[PDB]
Design a protein around this ligand. Structure first.
Ligand code: HEM
Ligand SMILES: [Ca+2]
Ligand SMILES: [Ca+2]
Length: 315
C-alpha cells in the first residue's frame, strides 16, 4: 500500500501509524530521545502483557492496565506505573488506536530511539480490553528465581526467554525500589541498549547507592547503579546463569532475541493471524554501539563466575 506520506507499507491500515509516530516522538519521547518516557513505556509493555495466565486469567497485551487503571495501577507490583499510564491516555484518546495497540507501538518506537536498539515487530488491531488483569501476575524483584520462572513460564516463557527479555534492564532505572534515589539505572549505560547490564549484574557487590535494606534490592558494584535482587539471583542461578553470561559482549544475540521475545510478549492474549503486520513503521535504531567492557577500575577477579560450563569471556 502507498500512504499519503509517499511511503509504501505492507498493509494499508498501517498508514494511520505515521501521524502517531510523529506525535509521540515529539510529545511523549521528548524529541525522540531514549529517555525516561521510553524506559517507562517499555516497562508498561510488560506490565500490560504479563497479566495473562491460561488458568488464572487476564487478557495479556490488551490495554487493560490503561482501561482499568484504577484497579491495576494499585496492585503493589505495579508501583510507579501510573505516571506513564496517565501520560499515555491523551495519545490514545486522540489517535484512534486501542490502548493495547498503543502500549506496544509506543514501546517499539521508544526502543528504536536507543543506540544499539532493535526493531520489535508490531501488529495492529488488538480490540479494547475486556476485563482487568487479576492481581499477582507481575513478578516482583524480591521473588525467588523459582517463583519468577514459574510465573513467566505460566505466561509462556522459558528460562532463556526470561533472560532475553531482561535485556530491557539495559535501558532502565528504578524510582520506587529505593525512593531516596529515584532514576538510578540498572547499568552504566541507561541510554544505550547494550550488554553492560549483563556484565555489571555479575560484578561482586560493594555498596548500596542509597540506603541499605530496601526490599528487592541487592548490593551494587557502583555508585549510581542500583541492583535488583531478582537480577542478582537470575545472573547466578544454575537455571539461568549460563544464558545470562552468553549475552555479555553478544550484541547481535541481545538484539535478535529481545525483538523476537518482545513480539511474543506483545501478542499474549492475542492471535497474530487476526492482526495486521505494521512492523515496517518502526524506525531503524541508531547503529553505533561500542565493545562490551568491564567498568573502569574493575578486572576479571571482580566477576562472579556463576556459569560452570563456560568461563566469562575476555572483553
Ligand atoms: C522478570 C522479572 C522482572 C522483574 C522482577 C522486574 C522488576 C523491575 C523493577 C523492580 C523495576 C523498577 C521499578 C521502580 O522501582 O521504578 C523495573 C524497571 C523496568 N523494567 Fe523490569 N522487571 C522484570 C522484567 C521486565 C521485563 C520482561 C521487561 C520488558 C519490557 C522489563 C522492563 C523494565 C524497564 C524498561 C524498566 C525501567 C523503567 C523506567 O526506567 O522508567 N522488566 N523492573
Ligand atoms: Ca493487560
Ligand atoms: Ca545499557
Amino acid at each position: 500500500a502507498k500512504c499519503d506520506d509517499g511511503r509504501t507499507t505492507a498493509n494499508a491500515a498501517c498508514c494511520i501509524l505515521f501521524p502517531i509516530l510523529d506525535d509521540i516522538q515529539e510529545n511523549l519521547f521528548d524529541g525522540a530521545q531514549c529517555g525516561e518516557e521510553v524506559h517507562e513505556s517499555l516497562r508498561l509493555t510488560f506490565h500490560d502483557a504479563i497479566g495473562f495466565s491460561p488458568t488464572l486469567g487476564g487478557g495479556g497485551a490488551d490495554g487493560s492496565i490503561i482501561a482499568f487503571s484504577d484497579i491495576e495501577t494499585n496492585f503493589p507490583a505495579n508501583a510507579g506505573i501510573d505516571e506513564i499510564v496517565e501520560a499515555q491516555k491523551p495519545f490514545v484518546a486522540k489517535h484512534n488506536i486501542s490502548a493495547g495497540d498503543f502500549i506496544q507501538f509506543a514501546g517499539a518506537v521508544g526502543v528504536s530511539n536507543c543506540p544499539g536498539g532493535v526493531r520489535i515487530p508490531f501488529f495492529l488491531g488488538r480490540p479494547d480490553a475486556v476485563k482487568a488483569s487479576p492481581d499477582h501476575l507481575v513478578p516482583e524483584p524480591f521473588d525467588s528465581v523459582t517463583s519468577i520462572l514459574a510465573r513467566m513460564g505460566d505466561a509462556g516463557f522459558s528460562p532463556v526467554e526470561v533472560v532475553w527479555l531482561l535485556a530491557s534492564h539495559s535501558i532502565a532505572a528504578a524510582d520506587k525500589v529505593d525512593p531516596s534515589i529515584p532514576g538510578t539505572p540498572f547499568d552504566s549505560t541507561p541510554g544505550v541498549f547494550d550488554s553492560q547490564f549483563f556484565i555489571e549484574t555479575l560484578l561482586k557487590g560493594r555498596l548500596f547507592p542509597g540506603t541499605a535494606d530496601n526490599k528487592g534490592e541487592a548490593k551494587s558494584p557502583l555508585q549510581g547503579e542500583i541492583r535488583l535482587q531478582s537480577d542478582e539471583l537470575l545472573a547466578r542461578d544454575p537455571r539461568t546463569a549460563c544464558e545470562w553470561q552468553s549475552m555479555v559482549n553478544n550484541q547481535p544475540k541481545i538484539q535478535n532475541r529481545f525483538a523476537a521475545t518482545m513480539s511474543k510478549m506483545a501478542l499474549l492474549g492475542q492471535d497474530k493471524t487476526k492482526l495486521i503486520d505494521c512492523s515496517d513503521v518502526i524506525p531503524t535504531p541508531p547503529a553505533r554501539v561500542g565493545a562490551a567492557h568491564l567498568p573502569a577500575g574493575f578486572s576479571l577477579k571482580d566477576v562472579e563466575q556463576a556459569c560452570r560450563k563456560t568461563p566469562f569471556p575476555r572483553l
